[PDB]
């Protein structure tokens, strides 16, 4: 209730033609606009019942950034972005207890451009049921963060990995986790 | 994929000091991670950060009503969005769930918001000085924080180890004993 | 309450 920072962060990426729009409060995402569905997606469902946001204005901004990106690309003699590989960290949100529910978090940090393939590997095999992820989150250094979540039940016989693919990495990066 | 990438970024930043009393607005435009134009509410006009933004700063500041609009953004944009989400962002309080389990004494403080938190170890009454390692504030990305703060100290007899957690969600310190 | 997007500005051309 004293010192805060609210950031409206937008980006547009050629030639992938992927843009994003989100509101950041003190490092947390208030909401983002799903460009496809043209809907406002609150990071917490409860937020959508206390505030609103007309997502159409986010799409108009992304259109303007797409158009400015082409302009800025020409001003720079088509200077491309230099890939920055990510530092990724796997952790849990709660102390681990056998047969007690928990969630695995894969924190992909300090990377650009905002394109990553993230796959959770249970016993070296990809797992998808129950997975979730955040949009790309802005950083003060103008790189990007991203959170991937995997709810699970800890067991002695289950080993987990977080497979991250980024164009800055010469090879895909696995971050391990066991008990 | 081989072809090069081009990234445009826009960040409209609202910096609040003592709530909506001192607000600074920053309209920041980026090519890759390079800021090229910026409106600073302390300056009152767009300024080029690099050469790449020189035509935008000159063009934008000349637009009809532009300077009036941007100079008003601390009220019409920042202070406004502050109050819109105040009840569930600035005022958001989620009390921490604390667990104290063994290692050559691990106080796990999970699920709290905001991230301003103080945890202090107490060995039978006095706060322990050395041996206190802290994992640091880590953000779960879901409006919850967590942190682990450990103590490297030998258990004696039936010495009571207490982890005292002070958090803006609680009126009084939360103490867990081992 | 409604959040207000700050509109993106069209670059000089």
């Amino acid at each position, epitope marked *: 209730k004293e010192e805060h920072v609210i950031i409206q962060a937008e980006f547009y990426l050629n030639p992938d033609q992927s843009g994003e729009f989100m509101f950041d409060f003190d490092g947390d995402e208030i909401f983002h606009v799903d460009m496809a569905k043209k809907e406002t997606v609150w990071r917490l469902e409860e937020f959508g019942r206390f505030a*609103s*946001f*007309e997502a*159409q*204005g986010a799409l*108009a901004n992304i*259109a*303007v950034d797409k*158009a400015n990106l082409e302009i800025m690309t020409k001003r720079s003699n088509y200077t491309p972005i230099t890939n920055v590989p990510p530092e990724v960290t796997v952790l849990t949100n709660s102390p681990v207890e056998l047969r007690e529910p928990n969630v695995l978090i894969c924190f992909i940090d300090k990377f650009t451009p905002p394109v990553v393939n993230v796959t959770w590997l249970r016993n070296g095999k990809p797992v998808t049921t129950g997975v979730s992820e955040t949009v790309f989150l802005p950083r003060e250094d103008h790189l990007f963060r991203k959170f991937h979540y995997l709810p699970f039940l800890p067991s002695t016989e289950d080993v987990y990995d977080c497979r991250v693919e980024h164009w800055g990495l010469d090879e895909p990066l696995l971050k391990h986790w066991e008990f | 994929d081989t072809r090069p990438r081009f990234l445009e970024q826009v960040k409209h930043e609202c910096h609040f000091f003592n709530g909506t009393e001192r607000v600074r607005f920053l309209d920041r435009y980026f090519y890759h991670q390079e800021e090229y134009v910026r409106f600073d509410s302390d300056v009152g006009e767009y300024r080029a950060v690099t050469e790449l933004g020189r035509p935008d700063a000159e*063009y*934008w500041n*000349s*637009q*009809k*009503d*532009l300077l009036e*609009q941007k100079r008003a953004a601390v*009220d*019409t944009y920042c202070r*406004h969005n502050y109050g819109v989400g105040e009840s569930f962002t600035v005022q958001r309080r989620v009390y921490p769930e604390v667990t104290v389990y063994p290692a050559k004494l691990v106080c796990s403080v999970n699920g709290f918001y905001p991230g301003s938190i103080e945890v202090r170890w107490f060995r039978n009454g006095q706060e322990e000085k050395t041996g206190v390692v802290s994992t640091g504030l880590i953000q779960n990305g879901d409006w919850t924080f967590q942190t682990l703060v450990m103590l490297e100290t030998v258990p004696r007899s039936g010495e009571v180890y207490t982890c005292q957690v002070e958090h803006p969600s609680l009126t009084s310190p939360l103490t867990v004993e081992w | *309450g*409604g*959040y*207000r997007a700050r*509109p993106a*500005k*069209a670059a000089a051309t």
Partner: T-cell receptor
Amino acid sequence: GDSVTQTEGQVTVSESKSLIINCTYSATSIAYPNLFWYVRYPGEGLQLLLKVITAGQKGSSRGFEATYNKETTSFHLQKASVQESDSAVYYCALSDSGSFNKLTFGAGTRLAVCP
Amino acid sequence: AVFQTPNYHVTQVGNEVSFNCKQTLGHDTMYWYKQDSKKLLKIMFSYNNKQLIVNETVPRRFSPQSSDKAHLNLRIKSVEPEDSAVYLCASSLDWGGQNTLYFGAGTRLSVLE
């Protein structure tokens, strides 16, 4: 669903008389409206007289005054002493401050100031 | 300023008409507004940087176009008598609801049977 109701038709006032042009709005689906008075002087195009973009404030121009009163949902237009040059059509307008600019206009009030 | 053209046009039902507008304010956003016979003002279109952002349920008979954010044109493919109106062009700094609209002098269209 969003409407603006203002003094209907023509208002004939002697110069130096005080003037009120009523304007109320119904915007059930708008969190924070913005309120505008636009004026069209004879043989000219529409232009802004004054606006208020903060629910408590009042705006003033050309000796006209209007107070954004969200409590009574009104934006009445007042002038203590109208001059012959105020003869014009006056439009009360509402916008949604959180979405794309779309003016919901009142029907407009023609002021004829008689010397 | 906001320049639009033509100032007056009369044409028969079924014909096509094109109105043109220019604004020199440096604004990103431009608008078509219809002022009908009884002088009621209603938004038709809003364009932001060449992209159509609002279409107030305008009949498909109407085709706006903008290849430059300073320019906004309106073509009515096959006018009907209800199209007789004054069509007002406007611009605003951007699409924010707080912005002042700057209006043009208007195009007086008369569609006759």
